[PDB]
Design a protein around this nucleic acid. Sequence first.
DNA 1: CGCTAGTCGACAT
DNA 2: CGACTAGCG
Length: 347
Amino acid sequence: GIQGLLQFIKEASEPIHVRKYKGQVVAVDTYCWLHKGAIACAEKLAKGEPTDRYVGFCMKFVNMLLSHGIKPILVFDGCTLPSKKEVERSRRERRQANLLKGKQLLREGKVSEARECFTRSINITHAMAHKVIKAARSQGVDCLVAPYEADAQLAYLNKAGIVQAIITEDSDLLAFGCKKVILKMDQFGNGLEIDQARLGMCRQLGDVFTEEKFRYMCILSGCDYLSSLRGIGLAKACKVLRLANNPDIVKVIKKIGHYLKMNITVPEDYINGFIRANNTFLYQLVFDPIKRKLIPLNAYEDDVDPETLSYAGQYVDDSIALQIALGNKDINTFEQIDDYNPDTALY
DNA sequence: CGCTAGTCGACAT
DNA sequence: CGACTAGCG
Ligand SMILES: [Mn+2]
Ligand SMILES: [Mn+2]
Ligand SMILES: [Mn+2]
Ligand code: NA
């Protein structure tokens, strides 16, 4: 997530209602609804006690979209991307820590702080997501599990003309290159739409409204793939890309000391990490619903060599990718949990 | 001004 | 997997 990005391009936003997309298809980052729905029943999840509140919680939004004449495609997170594995490990550590700390604070009499701590121990499993999948198929709503991050999958679905908008709370989608992103959408249909074409309405951006320059800016500001340099946020990065009339980003990053008038020293780790980040934003593996094949988010440019993009995602046989995408195969144990078939009845 | 980083809402009773 | 704000350049 790009920290403070939404406030940064606030001028490119537009308070709309989902009715705007009536008779059209919209893909959804379901993790948001899953998380929020899981907050309501944090105790049950922390104790391991059975629950299904988040299911109905998601079904509220789903049935709402269906009521306003929208066709939603619920997209779920799949395998763990090696690029964002540090953050994953940290989040897991803090999850277990908050779990046990909650289990101990429950004994101090502070039931309030125990549940407050259980709110920060929410771990969205793939079983829950599968409950949501089945519940969605009950209403005939198409579901799709991304090979890796949901972000990339959604980005593909939006850039390939399969969907026109993306419902989410993550500003990461904008960096990937989504045309229209609906944020802050409530249970009634009220959300904030950000159109890429409106990026020109931002004075702070300047000539950084192109997808590539915008990507560079989002990366330099700090992302889940690469921590930003000490003292480099959105405005300074944007300033760099504004003042730099150079297609080669590498030399620019090397002369970041010259562009920003700051005595900046760039480690060798950061250049490689940057190339990694950009290659991850560009060529992260997604799943084509039509051709049923594992493809990168974008067409492989002749610049980069695909054999050095293992961090962007590893390939598998497209049948396995299909069985994962349908949610039939477990993301973790790789074992068959279901046997749903779209043939014998999006694709 | 601009950026880091730590706090705490989100659900909902 | 986010929106504030104190604290500092
Ligand atoms: Mn993120
Ligand atoms: Mn995501
Ligand atoms: Mn993300
Ligand atoms: Na930053």
